[PDB]
């Protein structure tokens, strides 16, 4: 296959959060069939960010989910052309994030391009006050619709001073060529920030994810 047992990626993000413009550049690697990956991201413009890194972390890698042999891998089949995805995140306090992504394959490397816009975060809320400390383990509930894959997640940010801050995620994943469609299925996942400098201008993350039947 095009997707080897070890792969590297490069990522660029252009974004705004409550009108604060920034850019991120990074590189990552992982074992796509084992469902494990890491990335190291750097704020290249608009740092230090006046908001929680956790908003950005799920925007940095769909080739890296472990699939059982009986669930066709929507993303791995799409190569070498790749896929796009688009997402809306709606937080309990009215925060809203729109995200668009392109994934390609160039010079043996996966290439990610991301655009993000967040708005309506309360200025004294936990996102703009950097009061979150990472996402809980999640289950993405996916289903095919014609040639696209749709997924929904109930996501929960841990708050530094106690409790949880909830968001609904809705994503559509769009292969650039026809692939064999899976049935409905779930991805169980955990995303961790494994290292960061004090002002989160340099951040390492780690995801593990595994597809299973409903």
Structure-determination technique = X-ray
Q: H-helix or E-strand containing 51?
A: none
Q: What is the rounded CA–CA span in Å between residue 122 and residue 37?
A: 32
First-to-final CA distance of the chain: 27
Q: Measure the CA–CA gap between 76 and 97, rounded to whole angstroms.
A: 27
Those residues with Cβ within 8 angstroms of residue 72's Cβ, 6 or more apart along the chain or in another chain:
179, 180, 181, 182
Cβ(161)–Cβ(132) under 8 Å?
A: no
Chain center to CA of 200: 17
- Resolution limit, Å: 1.3
d(CA 165, CA 167): 7
**Residue 148 has which token pair?**
């696209």
Tokens representing 5 are 């047992």
| Residue-number span of the structural domain to which 123 is assigned | 1-214
At 59 the three-state DSSP class reads helix
State the total domains in the chain.
1
Tokens 């799920």 belong to which residue? 58
Looking at the chain, list the stretches that DSSP marks H as alpha helix, in order from N- to C-terminal side: 74-77
Cβ–Cβ under 8 Å, residues 25 and 45: no
């Amino acid at each position: 296959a095009v997707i080897k047992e070890f792969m590297r990626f490069k990522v660029h993000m252009e974004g705004s959060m409550n009108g604060h413009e920034f850019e991120i550049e990074g590189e990552g690697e992982g074992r796509p069939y084992e469902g494990t990956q890491t990335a190291k991201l750097r704020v290249t413009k608009g740092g230090p960010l006046p908001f929680s890194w956790d908003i950005l972390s799920p925007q940095f890698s769909r080739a890296f989910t472990k699939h059982p042999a009986d669930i066709p891998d929507y993303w791995k089949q799409s190569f070498p052309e790749g896929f796009k995805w688009e997402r809306v995140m709606n937080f309990e306090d009215g925060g809203a994030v729109s995200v668009a992504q392109d994934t390609s394959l160039e010079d043996g490397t996966l290439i990610y391009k991301v655009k993000l816009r967040g708005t309506n975060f309360p200025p004294d809320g936990p996102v703009m006050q950097k009061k979150t400390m990472g996402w809980e383990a999640s289950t993405e509930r996916l289903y095919p619709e014609d040639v696209v894959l749709k997924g929904d997640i109930k996501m929960a940010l841990r708050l530094k001073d106690g409790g949880r801050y909830l968001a609904d995620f809705k994503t559509t994943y769009r292969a650039k060529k026809p692939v064999q469609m899976p049935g409905a299925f779930n991805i169980d996942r955990k995303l961790d920030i494994t290292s960061h400098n004090e002002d989160y201008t340099v951040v390492e993350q780690y995801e593990r994810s595994v597809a299973r039947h409903s």
